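[job 0412] stage=complex_fold ligand=T82 status=START
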Amino acid sequence: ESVKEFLAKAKEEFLKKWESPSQNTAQLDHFDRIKTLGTGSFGRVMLVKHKETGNHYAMKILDKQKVVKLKQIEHTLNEKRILQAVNFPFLVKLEFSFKDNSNLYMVMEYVPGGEMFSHLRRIGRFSEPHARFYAAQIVLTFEYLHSLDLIYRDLKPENLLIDQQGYIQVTDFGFAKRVKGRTWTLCGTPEYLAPEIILSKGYNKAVDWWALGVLIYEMAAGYPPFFADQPIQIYEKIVSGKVRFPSHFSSDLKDLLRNLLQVDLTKRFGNLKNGVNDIKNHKWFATTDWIAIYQRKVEAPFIPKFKGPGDTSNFDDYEEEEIRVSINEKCGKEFTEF
Ligand SMILES: NC[C@@H](C(=O)N/N=C/c1ccc(O)c(Br)c1)c1cccc(Cl)c1
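[job 0412] stage=complex_fold status=DONE, emitting structure tokens
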């Protein structure tokens, strides 16, 4: 009943913000530009510093014209509307949002520890306890999101930041969507796509549980279970129902992975009558204190090294390009609700 009441309150609070989203809560000239932290085909993520408080933030800047051209309008509206409405210990917080003549802006908490992707590639692979610590946080985060009728749709190491306590902060909600029932958009990242996405089916939250299987495999092995030069070759492996496990994987890990990487979505853990409890009660998680993880009381396997809230040493170097704001409004109608 404790979990039920928790999720009931979580949904109440989410829906109130969902129905009345915040808008226009800062402006660009409140911030100093520090560094480019990431890029995409229609925007960039910057480290910025607020000029009055001195606080650092990560500012995602999306070019409205490129969002229109790449048919990402709905996805960008989803992203901001969801982010401003959610609240969970392992989700990055949206602090401000605004738009101008050219761009959309989401100003988020800055996590100086960097992406799990970098740490995993540096270390090689995580031990099972280390992978399990991160996996437990994703399980709880998906329990939360799915209870709000939200599908995340982009789980992968690049989207998981490691905070000062060594815990996960999920970011990059660009494909997240509120869905009752099924949805159809082809989106995600190839190595992490469930078979039903590849096969152009109507799909549901089970795709997130498939992606968790991919993530756990990748964390524990050091490479993803389905890999190839061309996406088509990846997709053939995904739909085949065949995966090879390293000998060092425990029996419990292999068993959990066969049930998450279940090609038949009607038999996949997380999508059965017992829902998330088939995962939480699996033997691989027998040592996990779910409440202690939620309360951030478990000592983390790994604390990223950084010097302070402005340190960027865990992020990569990108060309520093101008961020121009047109003298004239672009695509105003399309982004009215942002
Ligand atoms: N990796 C690529 C990704 C990215 O860099 N996201 N970073 C988010 C972030 C949030 C909060 C933070 O505290 C930190 Br630090 C980083 C991306 C880049 C450009 C456009 C788009 Cl749509 C997505």
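The CA atoms of residues 10 and 144 lie 8 Å apart.
[job 0412] exit 0
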